[PDB]
Amino acid sequence: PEFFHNMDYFKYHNMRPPFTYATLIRWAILEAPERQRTLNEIYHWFTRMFAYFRNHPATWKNAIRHNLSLHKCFVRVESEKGAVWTVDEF
């Protein structure tokens, strides 16, 4: 099922985070010191930061792509090293 109580960032039990894809991505982008990440770094962040997402990659990688291009507060910016995603706080 989903999270049994109020426990904080324990990523060590395969339990669904009680957060939207829209908001998890927003948090992953703002974690980077430059406030941007590549799509792969977002994939690495999700797996690293939650045990639940280590089991069915195709199910949620599709979701992450979907949310990025559906919400106006996610913006793609071309960099020297390639495409990255940023967040419009407004």
Added chain:
DNA sequence: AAATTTGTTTACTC
């Protein structure tokens, strides 16, 4: 020139 990842939509529940 594929192959494959990375971006956009659309639609269907709930």
Added chain:
DNA sequence: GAGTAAACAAATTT
């Protein structure tokens, strides 16, 4: 609106 699934197209690497 959120999560999921999918069809289809763009941009990017083998």
